[PDB]
Write a protein that binds this DNA or RNA. Structure first.
Length: 107
RNA sequence: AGAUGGUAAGGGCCCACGGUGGAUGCCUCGGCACCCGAGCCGAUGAAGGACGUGGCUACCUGCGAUAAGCCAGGGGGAGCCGGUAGCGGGCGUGGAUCCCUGGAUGUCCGAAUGGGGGAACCCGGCCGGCGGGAACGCCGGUCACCGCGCUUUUUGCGCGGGGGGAACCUGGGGAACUGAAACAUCUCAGUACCCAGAGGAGAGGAAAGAGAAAUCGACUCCCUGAGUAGCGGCGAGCGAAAGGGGACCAGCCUAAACCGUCCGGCUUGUCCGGGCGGGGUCGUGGGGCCCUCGGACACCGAAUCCCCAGCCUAGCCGAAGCUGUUGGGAAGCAGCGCCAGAGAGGGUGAAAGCCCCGUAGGCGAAAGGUGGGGGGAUAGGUGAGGGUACCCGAGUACCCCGUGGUUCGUGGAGCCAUGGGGGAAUCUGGGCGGACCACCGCCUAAGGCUAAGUACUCCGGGUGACCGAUAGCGCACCAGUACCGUGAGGGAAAGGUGAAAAGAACCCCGGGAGGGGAGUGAAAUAGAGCCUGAAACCGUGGGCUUACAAGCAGUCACGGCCCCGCAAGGGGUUGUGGCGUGCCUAUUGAAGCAUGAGCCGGCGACUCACGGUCGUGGGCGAGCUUAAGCCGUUGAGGCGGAGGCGUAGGGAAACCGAG
RNA sequence: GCCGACCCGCGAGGGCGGCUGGAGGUAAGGGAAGUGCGAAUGCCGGCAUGAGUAACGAUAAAGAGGGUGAGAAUCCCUCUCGCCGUAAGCCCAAGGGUUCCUACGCAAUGGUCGUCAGCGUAGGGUUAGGCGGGACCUAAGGUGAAGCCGAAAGGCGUAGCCGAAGGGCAGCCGGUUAAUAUUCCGGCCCUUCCCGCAGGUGCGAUGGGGGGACGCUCUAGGCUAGGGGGACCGGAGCCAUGGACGAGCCCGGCCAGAAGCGCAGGGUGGGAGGUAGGCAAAUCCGCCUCCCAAAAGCUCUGCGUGGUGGGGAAGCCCGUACGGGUGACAACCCCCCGAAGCCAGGGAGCCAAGAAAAGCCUCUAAGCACAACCUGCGGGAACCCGUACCGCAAACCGACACAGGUGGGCGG
């Protein structure tokens, strides 16, 4: 209950510490623990030579987690938080003046 | 022959490097206190457990043959199938999780309720259904006893009944320690606990009162009155009400008189009893009955009837920022800027009003729940007089006896309450004004109901000159768990990798265990019950010293050895010698062959409330100050003279009065 | 937190700097207190000391070989000795809960060990018409409509009901898995309830009686459980070292079983009449009179036997395991010994005077009389809880593989 952040599954840059100012994609909200997984923390893992799936060379990964509350919106600009207008019918959380919500697909 | 430094099995002393071990500091899904809101759960089967329940599943948690969930209503917008990772396979913008509501399933146990019983298992009567289904078996209904009201007694129909409860509340039972420095009488106390029951309150409740004034006007609550007045082996000590100021304000239903009516009987009779109805309610007393004035269109009108706003059971929008920069990390630092009905705070690799949640501000109910805030209705209430002589609460007042409560322990003992015995009256009847009598007042007994103001915290929300893992709830955590006892009962330990799992692939010795590199990142001296790592504590290396040596173990001086220091100084050490009866408690007095302590860490003891009392810091000054409460605030104060202290004392008292 | 030989304070402290560490800290001026520990045979915690010493559970005992494996005194295969043998062997309930069995495993748990194991891990295993128990009965006892009483809470408590290893009540032999087997398999024996066929009866009660049915001691005859000897039965072997093929040594030489057959014993006298007991309902028993008999019948049991299913050893072979074979066409006979057990309610004696209720036998009420009931044969149905594993001990009561204790049966 009340798990609402403001990080949509879309595309959004990073105003962080490590990968400050970094371009990241759909981010994949995971989950309620308040974390992201965009295209930032690309680390290698220390798994074993798991004879089938991790063949004879176990020492690899892909995209590693990272916290949510560090990434920020995008439109005809960059960041600038999203603001919601009730559109009478549906929703419209365009960007700080410079428009476009995010849900898209005839939104 | 003579002379004199020197070896260390091992010991001590120092520094350094470690190990056990946990202290500390700091953090905090816990707890704490109070304020405020809230306040009933059950036979429609509860509080509370048991067996289960998931595809792989011990616990938890949630739930129940429909078992981590079922259908509809609202919400809401991107994730979802729980903590607990994985296998595995689904969920959705033909809008899933989840929060709010209504109901569905709700096996077995607990008032347990067909019967039995050692709670959770074993039998059964009737009504019906499933198997070929009568023999065996399953399933839905129903089946205990209490009260009370109708039924033709009959069989029945019916509303209700039990168990629970954090604390408070009423009533029935009701100690002891302890105090009186003894101990009965008195205390503690009518307290603890036992029992009964009622409820958000309880209880209480309209005067047979108060109390002395032709004075007031249910009940509970606070303060004041007041440690006053009395009670008392006049000791312990216990300790009233009235008045005042405030909080809250509310008043009522019946019986008897008379009238009717249906029932019962009976010595039919202008009737003894009864069901129901009309009737009537009092303090200049009212009411009955007949007559007298005219009694009315109105006048009031809820505690009950209903409707709605407000209130909750989820949520929703929501003001303002960047570029460089040291650092693994910025919110830090610099430059320029913005918001504010919002500079509360939390987190975000650190310290942010403008990154994320959120604050101020504004909004929200299809279904449930709540509602005098206010509108409507409804039950019911409204008069002046005369006669009459009817009623006005009975085994009661009243008397006595044995007594409980009251300030009253037997007092001169009232009053209230009443266990035994006697034993009334109906407004010239009657209780009380503290023996009792006169009087004069006061109040109308022996039928019942009444909100609010007060109390209490299982519960939720807010706050803090409240604790930070020995403190705190016993429990921060898988705690009413382990384990201890048959038993009632007792009651532990136990937090913290990092910002993030990135929680260590590969080689190497090794059965493994555990290590040596790699590799991880800021940090691996953060390496997995791992932050920070005191001491006792046992090791390791090294610097000084000790194998002719008598000791509360050190102190002063002198000596050498080693390490520092530019000098002069200094540290570490101990060869010699001068000296030298451990610490505490208690004692006239002890090192004590008097007591207490193995060693280190953490806990651990003169407080507080009211009154009193000497001063002392101020303000006022023959004046000083308010308690309860009310208003305001969101750490904002302010009204509020009721009272207490003071202006005069003397005497037991009347009273006198600077005497 | 660690360190210090600097500075300041009379001191308690404070500053200082170095190292360590990683996000909190709070002056001057005031204020608030659970505030300053060395002791309390003080509370919790941790680590020494004795001391590498006491002890390492019965003095019944241990020796080798081979394997296993990183490792064997301590696990496993063999040989060797020794200690029990009214036990320390074998059951039974009680109790405890997975210890059992199989595969893998040793960090802890066994007073060392550890390749073992009651320890760890997953997997397996616990069958019932008949054994025990419940839809049967009661005991002493508890509860408990009614009755009574008590301030209450509660006490006694008739009927009723629960309540036992006591009653009664239907299953015995051998096989078989890794483990349960009176459960499953097979040879057989019988019980339960429904439907029908056939015969027969007045049926039929929770109500009446009969019965069950009972004490201690001595003890009867017969039978067996168990036990011994045999020239004889069957067989795989064996002559040693001085003798010997002797009736030589060694092995075993059965179990269950309906009808029927034989042996013993227990229960009981048949018939008639009347009855104002059984809290009348009676033909039933009690009872008063008669006839007959005392054998014997009737009857329940116990034994032996029986058609038949089943068993079967020493030795040796392989097999580590468990055992698979061997094991034979197997032998399965005779003389003796003799139960405390069986025939049960047997005989005798004694004084202490020796349960109750249902099954069952039985009489009728109410009522039914198509029914119901009894028998017989057939054909259908017969459930719910138990069993693994330890049980004179290491799994049970004693905090522990304690030398303690724990009722009964076999016990050569």
């Amino acid at each position: 209950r009340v798990k609402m952040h403001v990080k949509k599954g879309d595309t959004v840059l990073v105003a962080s510490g490590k990968y400050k100012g970094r371009v990241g994609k759909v981010k994949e909200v995971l989950p309620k623990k308040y974390a992201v997984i965009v295209e930032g923390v690309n680390i290698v893992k220390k798994a074993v030579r798991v004879s089938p799936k991790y063949p004879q060379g176990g020492f690899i990964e892909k995209e590693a987690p990272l916290h949510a509350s560090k990434v920020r919106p995008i439109c005809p600009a960059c960041g600038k938080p999203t603001r919601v207008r009730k559109k009478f019918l549906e929703n419209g959380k365009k960007i700080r003046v410079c428009a476009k919500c995010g849900g898209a697909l005839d939104t």
